[PDB]
Amino acid sequence: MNIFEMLRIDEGLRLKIYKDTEGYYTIGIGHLLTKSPSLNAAKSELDKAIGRNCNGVITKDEAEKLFNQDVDAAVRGILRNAKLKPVYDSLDAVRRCAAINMVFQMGETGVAGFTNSLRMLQQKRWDEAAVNLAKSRWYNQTPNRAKRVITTFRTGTWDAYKNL
Numbered sequence: 590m591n592i593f594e595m596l597r598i599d600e601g602l603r604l605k606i607y608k609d610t611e612g613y614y615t616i617g618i619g620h621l622l623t624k625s626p627s628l629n630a631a632k633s634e635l636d637k638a639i640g641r642n643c644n645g646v647i648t649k650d651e652a653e654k655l656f657n658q659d660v661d662a663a664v665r666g667i668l669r670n671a672k673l674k675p676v677y678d679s680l681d682a683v684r685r686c687a688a689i690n691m692v693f694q695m696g697e698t699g700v701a702g703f704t705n706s707l708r709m710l711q712q713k714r715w716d717e718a719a720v721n722l723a724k725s726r727w728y729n730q731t732p733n734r735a736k737r738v739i740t741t742f743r744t745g746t747w748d749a750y751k752n753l
């Protein structure tokens with residue numbers, strides 16, 4: 590398992606514009622199009638992202654291209670963030686995937702506010718970090734996914750994702 594397989598499990602794959610868990614227009618493997626209520630605004634964002642007139646539908650190859658771009662953006666975002674980079678650099682490979690997953694889902698400024706959890710993760714206090722991470726809107730709104738990500742942080746193994 591790697592970050593692509595992990596997020597593909599968590600985000601799924603849909604080739605037509607859909608609404609994510611928060612009700613926002615999204616496409617592909619969790620590619621957020623807009624937080625605007627307007628489907629037309631989303632369709633415009635999609636056409637801009639893909640570079641052709643899509644009429645709300647893309648191919649699997651296009652979805653995977655957006656996915657590559659989004660994962661890269663998440664990682665780069667972490668590396669450019671003064672609060673996130675040192676924690677990320679302190680982590681092992683598997684836990685780094687859990688970190689990218691959170692930033693992919695909630696964005697960099699969002700996770701950068703997870704201050705107490707970040708400290709515990711940098712200190713390698715895994716059980717404590719796991720407990721702290723669950724005290725969050727994140728956990729309460731998407732508990733099944735949060736539990737998988739937290740288990741990954743707690744154990745540094747892919748146990749939560751085996752058997753998908």
Ligand SMILES: CCc1ccccc1
Nearest residue numbers: 673676677688700703
């Ligand atoms: C809060 C988990 C985390 C750690 C490092 C970087 C991003 C996210």
